[PDB]
Scaffold this motif. Structure first.
Motif, short mmCIF file in Angstrom:
data_model
loop_
_atom_site.label_atom_id
_atom_site.label_comp_id
_atom_site.label_asym_id
_atom_site.label_seq_id
_atom_site.Cartn_x
_atom_site.Cartn_y
_atom_site.Cartn_z
N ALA B 73 1.20 13.07 -18.68
CA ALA B 73 2.34 13.95 -18.89
C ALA B 73 3.50 13.25 -19.59
O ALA B 73 4.41 13.93 -20.07
N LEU B 74 3.48 11.92 -19.66
CA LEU B 74 4.50 11.15 -20.36
C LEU B 74 4.01 10.65 -21.71
O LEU B 74 4.77 9.99 -22.43
N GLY B 75 2.76 10.93 -22.07
CA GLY B 75 2.20 10.49 -23.33
C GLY B 75 1.26 9.31 -23.23
O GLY B 75 0.73 8.88 -24.27
N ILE B 76 1.04 8.78 -22.03
CA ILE B 76 0.22 7.59 -21.82
C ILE B 76 -1.14 8.00 -21.28
O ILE B 76 -1.23 8.85 -20.39
N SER B 77 -2.20 7.39 -21.81
CA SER B 77 -3.55 7.57 -21.27
C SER B 77 -3.96 6.28 -20.58
O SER B 77 -4.36 5.31 -21.25
N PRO B 78 -3.89 6.20 -19.24
CA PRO B 78 -4.15 4.93 -18.56
C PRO B 78 -5.62 4.64 -18.35
O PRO B 78 -6.48 5.29 -18.96
N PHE B 79 -5.93 3.68 -17.49
CA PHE B 79 -7.30 3.28 -17.20
C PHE B 79 -7.66 3.39 -15.72
O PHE B 79 -8.86 3.48 -15.42
N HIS B 80 -6.70 3.35 -14.81
CA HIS B 80 -6.97 3.64 -13.42
C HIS B 80 -7.10 5.14 -13.21
O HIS B 80 -6.42 5.94 -13.87
N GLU B 81 -7.96 5.53 -12.28
CA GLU B 81 -8.09 6.95 -11.95
C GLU B 81 -7.00 7.39 -10.99
O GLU B 81 -6.51 8.52 -11.08
N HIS B 82 -6.61 6.52 -10.07
CA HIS B 82 -5.55 6.83 -9.12
C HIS B 82 -5.24 5.58 -8.33
O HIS B 82 -6.06 4.66 -8.26
N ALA B 83 -4.05 5.54 -7.76
CA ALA B 83 -3.68 4.52 -6.79
C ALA B 83 -3.97 5.03 -5.39
O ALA B 83 -3.71 6.19 -5.07
N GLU B 84 -4.54 4.17 -4.55
CA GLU B 84 -5.00 4.57 -3.24
C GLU B 84 -4.62 3.52 -2.21
O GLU B 84 -4.82 2.33 -2.44
N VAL B 85 -4.07 3.97 -1.08
CA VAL B 85 -3.70 3.10 0.02
C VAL B 85 -4.36 3.65 1.28
O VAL B 85 -4.19 4.83 1.61
N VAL B 86 -5.13 2.81 1.97
CA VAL B 86 -5.81 3.18 3.20
C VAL B 86 -5.25 2.31 4.31
O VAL B 86 -5.32 1.07 4.23
N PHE B 87 -4.71 2.94 5.35
CA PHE B 87 -4.09 2.20 6.44
C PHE B 87 -4.38 2.88 7.76
O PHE B 87 -4.75 4.06 7.82
N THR B 88 -4.22 2.11 8.84
CA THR B 88 -4.37 2.61 10.19
C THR B 88 -2.99 2.90 10.76
O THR B 88 -2.10 2.06 10.68
N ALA B 89 -2.82 4.09 11.33
CA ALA B 89 -1.60 4.43 12.04
C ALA B 89 -1.79 4.10 13.51
O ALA B 89 -2.84 4.40 14.09
N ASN B 90 -0.79 3.46 14.11
CA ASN B 90 -0.84 3.03 15.49
C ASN B 90 0.41 3.52 16.22
O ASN B 90 1.44 3.79 15.60
N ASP B 91 0.30 3.64 17.54
CA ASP B 91 1.40 4.07 18.38
C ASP B 91 2.01 2.86 19.08
O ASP B 91 1.29 2.05 19.67
N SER B 92 3.33 2.73 18.99
CA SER B 92 4.06 1.71 19.74
C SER B 92 5.41 2.27 20.17
O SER B 92 5.84 2.04 21.30
N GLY B 93 6.08 2.99 19.27
CA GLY B 93 7.22 3.79 19.65
C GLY B 93 8.41 3.75 18.71
O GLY B 93 9.22 2.82 18.76
N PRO B 94 8.54 4.75 17.83
CA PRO B 94 7.54 5.73 17.38
C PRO B 94 6.97 5.36 16.00
O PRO B 94 5.92 5.86 15.60
N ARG B 95 7.68 4.51 15.27
CA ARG B 95 7.26 3.99 13.98
C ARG B 95 7.27 5.05 12.88
O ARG B 95 6.59 6.07 12.97
N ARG B 96 8.06 4.81 11.84
CA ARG B 96 7.97 5.55 10.59
C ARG B 96 7.26 4.69 9.54
O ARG B 96 7.39 3.47 9.53
N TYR B 97 6.51 5.35 8.67
CA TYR B 97 5.72 4.69 7.64
C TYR B 97 6.20 5.15 6.27
O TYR B 97 6.34 6.35 6.03
#
Lengths: 116, 116, 116, 116
Positions: B73-97
């Motif tokens: 949409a800005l005129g650039i044709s990149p090479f990555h398909e997408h950025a991806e982050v995989v993480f585990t959510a844990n309870d401790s009290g209360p934590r924002r991510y």
């Protein structure tokens, strides 16, 4: 609204970098670095109020982040002496500048973000 | 106050990444990725209101940022398909991510920031 | 000469990431991820010999780096489940691909480098 | 085998950064930066032979990468003046140092890698 802000994050602890010393320098006509502003990041890792629209003029600026001292206050002895960003400020109307820094003991990333 | 935020920056233009599509998935008991939430970054490059404290429970989450479409949409044709982050959510009290992402056509950096 | 290499660095220890598990997947026509190749980084943090020029054809590939297990073998319990890079392979003549990764417990950076 | 190497990558083009000027300085006893070594990256983005084991002694070193000139030789006018890494060299036996840099017009990442 300040034209220059610095935000610092901690990649080891996954949190904002709190109470990091930041020194800003401006290149004078004699090609020497002259202290311009400084401060310490807040609990959010952000440092506001470094300068004003009237004081922040075109020129070459250096933002020095004292990473070594911050790591040692957390128990870490790093290998970089400091993170440093040197950029040119330009006038177009009016432009705010934010320096974002991501710190690791042996690596750092800095980004210059320009918003209106 | 939302427990999950995503901020995206553009290293090529030195600005927030505006109107980037973000998809969040949660790993169910059947080990399949189940759509959880999604949205688009605002003019500040931030996406708020993805979920609520009641809906955001412990588990494995995947944050997929549609970098390829944004670059085009800005005129650039990149090479990555997408950025991806995989993480585990844990309870401790209360934590924002907060997931912070820095995008280039052939490189990306992601940071998981945890605040209270 | 292999057309696909992966190099992994450790931002916390300032060294190559040794014995990191790397899994490569290819998207088949049924839109499912099919195991393609895998291995472990050497003492230099590099993984060679993943595939051959004859096996490495155009398509969508996913490079998954098992960061969580590597951190726990060094005494660190991180928060990301793994670093993942998804890219499209294209034919032009002949193109080698190197995925470079920089790892921190709560942050990672990946770069797609294309050499001839 | 050189004790100090610099490698530079281009996140916009997804390639090594070729013919980037690199200047290395050492802090003398008078607390002034004294030119130590310099060179230009090769087609692989690597700069070898900066110094020798006999010349590379403990001290404070500054590695300055002339990013601004490199971007303008490719058609890009960036906003950083240069990428700079300041680190302390220490003796333990014998330690090689590699500075890895990832360049974007408005962002850069540097890593200090220490191998034996």
């Amino acid at each position: 609204k300040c034209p220059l802000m610095v935000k610092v994050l901690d990649a080891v602890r996954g949190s904002p970098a709190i109470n990091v010393a930041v020194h800003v320098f401006r290149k004078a006509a004699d090609d020497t670095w002259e202290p311009f502003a400084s401060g310490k990041t807040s609990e959010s890792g952000e440092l506001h109020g470094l300068t004003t629209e009237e004081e922040f003029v075109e020129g070459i600026y250096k933002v020095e982040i004292d990473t070594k001292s911050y790591w040692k206050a957390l128990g870490i002895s790093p290998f970089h002496e400091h993170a440093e960003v040197v950029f040119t400020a330009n006038d177009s109307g009016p432009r705010r500048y934010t320096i974002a820094a991501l710190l690791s003991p042996y690596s750092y990333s800095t980004t210059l973000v320009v918003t209106n």
